[PDB]
């Protein structure tokens, strides 16, 4: 009952944030493009970034709401920690990992393939990129598609760590400080995709970037 309570809350507020970020992230690009089929073919490209951001923000809004209106004091006071509440959402995070794995591996290339013809390694089919790991350009793109979906898991254990907020501080107090901590992971991963494409860093740095953020989030959640 407590797992279904959280999953229903997180899914409801993540879809609101995702639809709010899609209207903002691609409303800005649509205006720049104006300066309807193009937006349709770039849905999987932007939702590749919005989905980890929507899940992270939606996780902190739910965990912020539990703290603000004292539903966390009665959950900790009943024997259910905050770490335990984050472990109840692993089945949900696995669904979002599978969902984004579909976007990153299939629809992001397919969406970029049709857009390119209408308007590159960003749009090549994943079948043609499974092999040819020797070439750093394919190595960066294929690694971006395999280790990319695992930002959902990192968005789960890092939103649990950075959600503790006082009732008087507010539900939105820890949003801007911690969205930048999450965004620093994605900005680092985009900054890693470029380094691998120039054969300067190696494909091994994708799990290393996640592990450093994974261990840092796990240590901070257990302080």
């Amino acid at each position: 009952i407590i797992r279904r309570y959280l999953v229903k809350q997180v899914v409801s507020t993540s879809l609101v944030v995702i639809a709010l970020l899609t209207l903002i992230m691609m409303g800005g690009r649509l205006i720049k493009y104006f300066g309807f089929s193009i937006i349709g073919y770039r849905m999987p490209e932007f939702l590749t970034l919005i989905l980890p951001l929507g899940f992270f923000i939606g996780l902190m809004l739910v965990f912020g709401r539990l703290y603000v209106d004292h539903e966390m004091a009665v959950l900790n006071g009943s024997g259910i920690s905050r770490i335990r509440l984050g472990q109840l959402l692993i089945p949900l995070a696995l669904v979002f990992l599978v969902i984004q794995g579909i976007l990153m591996l299939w629809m992001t290339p397919w969406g970029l393939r049709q857009f390119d013809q209408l308007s590159k390694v960003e749009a090549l089919p994943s079948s043609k990129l499974w092999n040819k790991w020797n070439d750093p350009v394919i190595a960066s793109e294929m690694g971006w598609r395999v280790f990319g979906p695992f930002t959902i898991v990192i968005a789960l254990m890092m939103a649990v760590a950075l959600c503790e907020v006082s009732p008087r501080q507010g539900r939105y107090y820890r949003l801007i400080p911690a969205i930048f901590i999450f965004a620093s992971l994605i900005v680092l991963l985009i900054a890693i995709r470029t380094r691998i494409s120039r054969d300067e860093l190696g494909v091994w740095a994708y799990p290393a970037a996640l592990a450093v953020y994974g261990i840092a989030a796990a240590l901070f959640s257990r302080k």
Binding site: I24, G27, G28, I31, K32, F34, G35, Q169, G170, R171, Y172, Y173, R174, L175, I176
Partner: protein, 234 residues
Amino acid sequence: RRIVAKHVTKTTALAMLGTTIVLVILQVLFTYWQAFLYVLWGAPRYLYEILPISALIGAILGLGTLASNSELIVMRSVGISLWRIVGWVIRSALVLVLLSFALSEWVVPYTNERANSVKDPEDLSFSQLVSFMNYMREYSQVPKTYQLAFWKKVASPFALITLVLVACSFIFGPLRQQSMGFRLVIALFIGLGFYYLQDFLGYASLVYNPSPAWFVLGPIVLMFVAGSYLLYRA
């Protein structure tokens, strides 16, 4: 009344200037030895484009501190109207408007020349823009991309004051009794919403027959009317 006016003005002015210092530092870092001077010389041009959005966040945080501390309730409890408290905040914004004029007229056109040496109609200063348009009009037809640039500059002080009044009306209206984080989040959505709306309607003025004055002064008049209505609801 002077002591109350100074307290409201100084608190908002420090919030508008405090947000300005932070927003410029972040934008300098985000934009970023030869490449450091090129970004450092561009600070006045980054400063000019932050003033409309730093005044919005400054009035949200400046009045939010007053509202959350129940200081705006006891100014009304003694007979100080909402439009008087807005007028005191506008005095703080009038420093940013005067700063916008100083940057536009004497600072931006100079550091832009210095920045380009280290390494558009929008980039032209108002003194250069009006003089150039008057020169073209005397011998040829002025393009619609210069009329839009002219209207986007003459309506820059009026977009700073209107966006401040909207911020003040939100504190007294929808954003009353809300958290400081929620006010900051909403202040960021209005800032992006205004930048996108003025960008889109700027492009739409170059593709449609009506003059760019309608598209540039459109949102400013509507936000002023809508913002002044939220103040009438108290």
